[PDB]
Amino acid sequence: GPHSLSYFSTAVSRPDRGDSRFIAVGYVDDTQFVRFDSDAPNPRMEPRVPWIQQEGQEYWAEETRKVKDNAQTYRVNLKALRGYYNQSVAGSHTLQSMFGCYLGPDGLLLHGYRQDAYDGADYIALNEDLRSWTAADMAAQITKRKWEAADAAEQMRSYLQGLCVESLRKYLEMGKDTLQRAEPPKTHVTRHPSSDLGATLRCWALGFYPKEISLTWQREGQDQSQDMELVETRPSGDGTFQKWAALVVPPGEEQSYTCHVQHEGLQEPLTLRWD
């Protein structure tokens, strides 16, 4: 692999509405499979892909129970943090939490993690030994101290080692026909005339999965990265991804340039030129 299961949660205080909003999303590798929005009518954990829908009612009831508990708890944390820092009562603040597990070679936990941020800044994070915390400032040390006496790390560690990996193995099976097959990119090289000394070639990679991909340009075998424009990998909207890399080639030199595409869905690296 390594495959992964991860959750991303965002809690935002709304003093002008008397409460806060909590949003959580779950991923298996690059595929979001669940979501929770505390603003939604009847807030519950909802499926986001077909394969997770085969989970029974107790799954959804339990995930909803837990995520609502997470929401209420982080609403309180926001209130605490405002005091801890002595911030305004009218200001809206943001609490982000991220955590997940990777699947090791022998089916055991690989690099579990847990990290929280307040207003974009590091707050507290679980260390690599899964038994200690790094606190980023004065306020975070107060929290860190509580969590040490209460051995909060053991809860997190046992989750990452047990339930998290176990669920990951279970999810990978449920969505095997989708999560375990790499979908290779559809590739294209397009051309777009600019000015006298301006003629742009663009190499496209479309509809691929997983997200990881490598697009590069060569000139007779010479990397042109320093010259090319590479956009951020972007979602296609159907669970796949897109990306492109473009550069300006001299008038008449199209055929000296080649785009190279590398992705796990591909048997071998693809060499593309302006056909």
């Binding site: 959750y7 837990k66 508990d69 708890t73 605490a80 929290t143 997190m156 998290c164 669920s167």
Partner: peptide, 9 residues
């Protein structure tokens, strides 16, 4: 699956 409980700051 989400963890069982979530800690106060």
């Amino acid at each position: 699956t989400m963890p069982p409980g979530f800690e106060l700051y």
